[PDB]
Design an enzyme around this catalytic site. Sequence first.
Site, short mmCIF file in Angstrom:
data_model
loop_
_atom_site.label_atom_id
_atom_site.label_comp_id
_atom_site.label_asym_id
_atom_site.label_seq_id
_atom_site.Cartn_x
_atom_site.Cartn_y
_atom_site.Cartn_z
N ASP A 127 9.66 8.46 7.83
CA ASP A 127 8.79 7.39 8.30
C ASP A 127 7.95 6.83 7.16
OD1 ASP A 127 7.18 5.70 9.71
OD2 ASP A 127 6.00 7.28 10.70
N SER B 163 6.43 -11.34 2.62
CA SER B 163 7.65 -12.11 2.68
C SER B 163 7.33 -13.58 2.43
CB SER B 163 8.30 -11.92 4.05
OG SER B 163 9.40 -12.79 4.26
#
Length: 330
Positions: free
Chosen positions: A35, A199
């Site tokens: 994770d 992004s």
Amino acid sequence: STGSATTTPIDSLDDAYITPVQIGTPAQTLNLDFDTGSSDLWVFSSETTASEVDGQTIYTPSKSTTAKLLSGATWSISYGDGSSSSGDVYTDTVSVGGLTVTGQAVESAKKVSSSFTEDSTIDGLLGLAFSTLNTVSPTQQKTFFDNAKASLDSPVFTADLGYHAPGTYNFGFIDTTAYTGSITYTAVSTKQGFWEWTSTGYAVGSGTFKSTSIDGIADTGTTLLYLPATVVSAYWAQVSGAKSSSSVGGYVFPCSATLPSFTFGVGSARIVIPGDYIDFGPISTGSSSCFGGIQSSAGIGINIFGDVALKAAFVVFNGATTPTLGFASK
């Protein structure tokens, strides 16, 4: 040193991925959920409340000659999906894919929430976010990666998750045969303890690319892609009959649909998520309403590039002094 381990979907939907991890001496192999959005290595154990164990493999520290109680240390964690676990702490030898760390903090669960109990395939979590998020008190502990780093050939790990198929976690090297083209690297902020990046925009299907900054985290422990409501609405508007259902808990779409792809930007590069990766199947057995793999982050408080996004790429988690993230197509 290096390590290389195969990671395998837990079910037919790729809800999560498990990776075998050797703990203790002699080795006890547990299947852990790696994770990158948390920083605790915790396991089902001989100390876990018996009624909260249902099929998991447990770590038994009393059977490990190298286990030592970390005296006074406790841990307690709550995840974004509302699940939680807590317990005490041992140090022991931990190996992943041939890479060994001695003195790793292994957090032994005394209690786990129902979602963990109900998932017989996941024996615990191995956190790979920054150690500043580790929950051990009163002495915070380091992640497996942080402990391994100095010994690694290069201070990196990579995630290569499969779509309905096994993939690979590598430590200490970049497998140049595992991706196509070049890797595009992008800046990371560690201010919140995550692999947080920005992004450069998105496209829906064959549509034009929208240049827009989307801050979010690369999180292998989250199944879906969670993005701003504007972006998510633009995606689902291209699917006839799709709608946001408050009763179900997100966007659903007719199972008869063909889903468009979704592209996200990494610098000037583009990663394309095929439409099929966005299908999470019937909302309940036999239903003709299917659950979407792109959902709104509104009210999470952060955008999350979870498995839906990451499995479309070869992803480099560069833990050099100034960390960065790399993405390549594959």
